[PDB]
Design a protein around this ligand. Structure first.
Ligand SMILES: O=C[C@H](O)[C@@H](O)[C@H](O)[C@H](O)C(=O)O
Ligand SMILES: O=C[C@H](O)[C@@H](O)[C@H](O)[C@H](O)C(=O)O
Ligand SMILES: O=C[C@H](O)[C@@H](O)[C@H](O)[C@H](O)C(=O)O
Ligand SMILES: [Cl-]
Ligand SMILES: [Zn+2]
Ligand SMILES: [Zn+2]
Ligand SMILES: [Zn+2]
Lengths: 413, 413, 413
C-alpha cells in the first residue's frame, strides 16, 4: 500500500517520467525527409513564439529582423530576451530546459559553445538523442500535400521511420477551396465550377489518394473562431459530402483545432496569428449527427475550455486533446488538466508538444509532465483519503492511457 | 486519515495545544495560601532570571537594586532589558508571551497600561484566567516545611484547592542536617547527638507526619554536583535509613534535582546559583539497590543529559522529567527532548514550568509545547513514511502521556 | 516598527553585513611591523589547520613536509585536500571564501593565477583591500614581549596604525616562570629565588613597563584544562599578587583562553595542540573574589560552553567571547551562539577571527556573520510573534553591541 502522499508523489513522478510518450501533434518530420525537419539552438531561438516576444522589446524593425540571417536573428533574440531581461516567459524557459537536457550549461550563457554541440552531429543522431531524452516513442507529424517541398518527399516514395506517423492536414482544401480547387485540377482532379456529383467524387478521390499514400492516423484542420456547421460554404459542403463519408469508411478520426484568427498582423508571419472564442454549436452538431465518425478536438480560447470538457461528457465519439498554443502555459495547462480529469477521469489526452523544432520535445514534455504529475498526485491522494487503495501498477496503467494508449485506442491503431 | 507530514503537523499541533497540562514542579501556591502566590507584571519582571540578566547591563549596584521597591526594580529591568536592548533572551521573551496571552499588546510597550490590567483583578480571578489560558489542569507545588511562613500555613490548616498538589521539599533536612537537627528537636522530634535508633525513628516520624499533613505526590530535594550514594554522611544515612523506607511504605516517589551549586554569588540571592556536572554513580546505585522505590530525576548540567537518558533505559523505576533551569532554553529543550524520545519513546515527562510567578505558566508551556510539537511531528512522520498508520486518537493518547498521564501513573494516583 | 518576518530578516542581515567589525583576538600585526604579518594564498593554504588535515591524507612524512618550501607545501595541500577530495572541511571552505571575496574565481581551480594576484600588491595594499572586504575596522593583535623578533620592534619604536590594537600576551611568564624569570633578570627585573616582596614588585614593574609601551586593551594568557585558582604555584602567585592588582589599577581586563593541551604531537608544530575540559572552579573564584577586575573568557572544550554561559549569568565582571579554535566550526558556533543569546540576551561577544593570515578575515567573518544573523533573525522573530516590534535602529544598535560596542565598553576605551 501507499500510506503517504510523499511516497505517492514519488511513485507518480517516476511513472509519469518513465512512461514513453506518443506525441499526437507536432510539426516535426522523420529524419529521412530532409531539411524540412528543423533542429538546433538557432532554430530554437527563432521559434515564432520568441519572434513575437522579441518584437515587444527590440527596436529593430520586423522588416530588418527578417532581413538578417538565422544566426543573426538568434543573436538578437538571445540578447533581448535572455540577457537584457530575465528569460522568465514559458517559451524562453523552454529553450533553457532544452539546453540543460542536452547536457549543456545555461549558467555560462556561452551561445557559441552551445552552437558547437549541434554542428558536430547529424539529423539522424540528434533525433535519436532527443527522442531518448524526452522519452518520446511516437511522433505524429503534420503532413500537408499542398506544400510543394513536403509533397515532393511523398511523391518520391519516401516513408517515415516507425517512430513517425502521418496526419493529413487539409487547411488549404477546406479553408481556401476557391483558390485551391485550381491546384487539384492541375493534379488531375476534375473538380467543377459548381458543386455537383463530379466535384464531390474528385475531392473524395483526392482525400482517398493521400490516405493511401500517407496512411495517416487522422485528417486535420485548424478553424477560425467563427467556425460553423452545417454551413453553405465550400468548407461546410466539403466536410459534409467528402471528408466525413471518407473518414467513416476508413475509420479515421477528424482532428479539428478551433479558435485561430490567422494573420491579424501579417508582417509577423507565423507569429501573427490571434485567437477568439468559438461557438460549440458546430462541434455539437457534428458529434450528434455523425455518431459513426470520430473527432479529435482542441480549442484555442481559454473561454472555450470548460464547455469543451462538458461536451466530451456528452459524446463518446469526441476525444479532446492537449493545451494548444496560447493554452500551452503553466497556469492554463494546470486549470485545463484539472477540469478535464475532474469531469472525465482519465478518458482524455492531456497534452501534445506541437514542436516545430526537434529539441522542443525535451522542454514541452518536461514542463508538461511535471504539471500533469502534480494533478495526478492530488487526484490519487483524494481517493486514497476516501479509503481507496491505489496500486503502483494501476498508476502506471493510468499514466500509459494519458500519455499514449488513449490516442492509439481512439484512432484504432 | 493522516497520510502526510503536512496533515500530521496539523493534528499534532492541535492535540498538543488542546492537551490539559499537569505541571509537576512549580513554585506556585494554591491562591488560598495568600500572598505567597506571586503574580502580575511587576513580579514577572523581577523573576530572578531577569535579576541576573539586568545586572550584566545596569550600572545600578546589586545592593541598591534590593533596596528599591518592587515597581522600581521592575521599571529598571524593563528599561535595561527591553528598551535599551531588544528583549531577545528566553526569560525576556517569556514576559512578552505572557502579556500577549492576557490580551495585552507588547507592540505598545505601555507598561503603565499593562499594570492597570492586574490592579483591577483578584488572585482567585487571575488564577482562573491563567490556568485557562495556559490550559493547565494541575499544578504541583514545592512545599518547604522548614520555611517558617510556609510551615505555619500547613500547621494552621491551610489546604490547596483541587487544582494544586503538594510536594514535600526536604533540602534543609538532607543537605544541612547539622543545623536542621536542632530545629527538629525544637518541634518535638527527639533526634540525638549520634545517629542511633532514636534519631532514625524520629526523622522517620517527621517525614510521616508531614506526608499525612500534605498528602504529597512525592518528596523532593535539590542536590549538588558532588552528590554521591551510598555515602557515610548525614545525607547518605538519612536517605538510606529514613527517606527510602518511608517512601516505599507510602509508595511515594523520591524526586532528585541534581547539579545545583548553591550561592556562588551570595549577593544575588535566588539568582546566585551555579551548575556542575554530576557523577551518575549515586543515581545508578539508588535505582539498582532499591527496585521497590520510585525515582523522579532531572539534572542541571547539559553534559549529564545524554547519560541520564541511557540510565532510564536501564531502570524502569527511574522516570526522568523536565528541562530544568539552565536547561530550560530552546536550543537545549530541543536536543534533550529529541535524545529522550529517540531512546525512550514516550516513556518520560518532557517538561515542567518551575513557575515562580503565576503568569509564567503561559509562556513556559507555550514556548515548550511548540518545540515538543515539532519533535513529535518529526518522530511521527518518520514512522508514517515507514508505512505505519498513525491515528489522531493514538496521537492524543501519546500526547496525554507526555503532558499528564505519565506523571500520575508514576506517582500512583 | 517591523511587523513582517520577511522585512525583519532583510533588516537584520543588512545590519549584520554593514556593521564594521572589531576583531578582538587575532594573530595579525599592523603592516608596518614587517614580514611578521602573514598574507596570500600560500599562507592561507599552509595555515596549521590545513597542516593537520593534509597529514591525515598524504603519504608524505611530516618531516618531508617541513623540509619542502612554502610553495611546495601549498601545492601538496591544494592537491591533497582540494583536488583528491572535495574541500568540504571548514578550513578548506575558508580558503575558497577568501579567494572568491578577493574577486578570484575558485571555479577554474587555477592556483597559479590566484598566486599572481598577490604578487602584484604590497602588504599595506592588501590590508587595505582585506579590511574593506571583511568590513573590519579594528584588529586586536597578540603581542608577545618574550618573542625576540616582536620585542625588538616594540623597543625600536614601532607602533601599529590606528586600526591595529595591542594585547599583552603573557604565556611564558605565567606558565613557564621558572625558565622565564632568568630572562626577566637579563632585562633588569631582579626577581628573587623565592616569591617575596622583591619578586612581586619586579614582576609588577615588568607588566607596567609593557603596559605603558604597548598600551594594550587587555592582558592575555592561554591556559591548560588543569588550570586552577587559587593555586600555590608560580602562576597562582603571579596572577594573585601581580597581574590582578596591576590590571585593576590600569582598569585593564584579564583575558583567559582556557582548555588547550600544548604539544601533544610536537612534530606537527603549531598544529600539534590538543584540548581538554576544564573545571570552572578557578574562573568562579576569580570572578567572585576580584569584583573590581574585568575578565574576558573563551574556552576550548565543547563541554565547557554551557556552564561558562551560566557563569556569565552570575558575574557581570565576566565577558565571554568567541568560538575559539576547535569551537570555530558551524555546528558549534551555532549551538554556542544560541545558548548564549538565550541566557544572556546581547550581553556577550559572539566571535573573534583568530586570523593568523591576513585574508582569513574575509572567511572568518563571512562564515560567522551568516550564522549570527540566522540566530538573531530567529530570536527577533520569536518576540515578533509575541507581539513585540523592533525598529531598524534598535537592530543596528544590538548588532553594533555584539560586533564592536560590547568589547570597547568592557575594556573601557
Ligand atoms: O503552437 C503553435 C503552432 O506552431 C502554430 O503555428 C500552428 O499553426 C498550429 O498549431 C496549427 O497546427 O495550426
Ligand atoms: O528554575 C529555577 C528555580 O526557580 C530555582 O530557583 C529553584 O531553586 C530550583 O528549581 C529548585 O526547585 O531547587
Ligand atoms: O585558533 C587557533 C590559533 O591559531 C592557535 O594556534 C593559538 O595558539 C591560540 O588561538 C592562542 O592564541 O592561544
Ligand atoms: Cl466568455
Ligand atoms: Zn500545430
Ligand atoms: Zn524549582
Ligand atoms: Zn589565538
Amino acid at each position: 500500500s501507499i500510506n503517504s502522499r510523499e511516497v505517492l508523489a514519488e511513485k507518480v513522478k517516476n511513472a509519469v517520467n518513465n512512461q514513453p510518450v506518443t506525441d499526437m501533434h507536432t510539426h516535426l518530420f522523420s529524419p529521412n525527409f530532409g531539411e524540412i525537419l528543423l533542429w538546433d539552438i538557432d532554430e530554437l531561438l527563432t521559434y515564432h513564439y520568441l519572434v513575437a516576444e522579441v518584437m515587444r522589446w527590440t527596436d529593430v524593425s520586423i522588416e530588418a529582423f527578417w532581413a538578417m540571417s538565422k544566426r543573426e536573428q538568434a543573436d538578437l533574440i538571445w540578447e533581448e530576451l535572455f540577457i537584457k531581461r530575465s528569460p522568465v516567459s514559458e517559451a524562453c524557459r523552454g529553450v533553457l530546459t532544452c539546453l540543460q537536457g542536452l547536457g549543456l550549461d545555461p549558467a555560462t550563457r556561452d551561445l557559441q559553445v552551445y552552437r558547437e554541440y549541434f554542428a558536430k552531429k547529424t539529423s539522424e543522431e540528434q533525433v535519436d538523442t532527443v527522442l531518448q531524452l524526452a522519452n518520446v516513442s511516437d511522433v505524429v507529424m503534420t503532413n500537408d500535400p499542398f506544400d510543394d517541398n513536403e509533397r515532393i518527399s511523398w511523391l518520391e516514395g519516401k516513408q517515415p521511420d516507425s517512430r513517425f506517423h502521418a496526419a493529413l492536414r487539409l487547411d488549404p482544401l477546406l479553408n481556401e477551396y476557391e483558390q485551391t480547387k485550381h491546384r487539384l485540377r492541375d493534379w488531375g482532379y476534375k473538380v467543377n465550377d459548381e458543386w455537383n456529383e463530379g466535384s464531390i467524387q474528385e475531392v473524395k478521390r483526392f482525400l482517398t489518394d493521400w490516405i493511401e499514400r500517407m496512411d495517416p492516423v487522422y485528417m486535420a484542420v485548424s478553424l477560425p473562431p467563427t467556425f460553423s456547421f452545417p454551413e453553405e460554404s465550400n468548407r461546410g459542403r466539403i466536410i459534409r459530402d467528402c471528408l466525413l463519408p471518407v473518414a467513416e469508411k476508413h475509420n479515421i478520426p477528424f482532428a479539428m483545432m478551433i479558435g485561430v484568427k490567422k494573420r491579424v498582423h501579417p508582417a509577423l508571419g507565423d507569429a501573427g496569428d490571434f485567437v477568439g472564442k468559438a461557438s460549440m454549436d458546430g462541434v455539437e452538431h457534428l458529434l450528434r449527427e455523425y455518431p459513426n465518425n470520430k473527432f479529435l478536438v482542441t480549442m484555442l480560447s481559454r473561454e472555450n475550455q470548460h464547455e469543451l470538457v462538458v461536451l466530451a461528457r456528452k459524446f463518446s465519439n469526441l476525444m479532446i486533446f492537449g493545451c494548444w498554443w496560447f493554452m500551452n502555459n503553466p497556469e492554463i495547462i494546470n486549470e485545463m488538466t484539472r477540469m478535464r480529469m475532474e469531469m472525465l477521469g482519465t478518458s482524455f489526452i492531456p497534452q501534445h508538444s506541437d514542436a516545430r523544432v526537434l529539441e522542443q520535445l525535451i522542454y514541452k514534455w518536461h514542463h508538461s509532465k511535471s504539471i500533469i504529475a502534480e494533478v495526478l498526485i492530488d487526484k490519487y491522494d483524494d481517493i486514497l483519503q476516501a479509503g481507496w487503495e491505489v496500486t503502483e501498477e494501476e498508476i502506471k496503467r493510468d499514466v500509459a492511457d494519458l500519455f499514449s494508449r488513449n490516442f492509439w485506442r481512439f484512432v484504432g491503431r
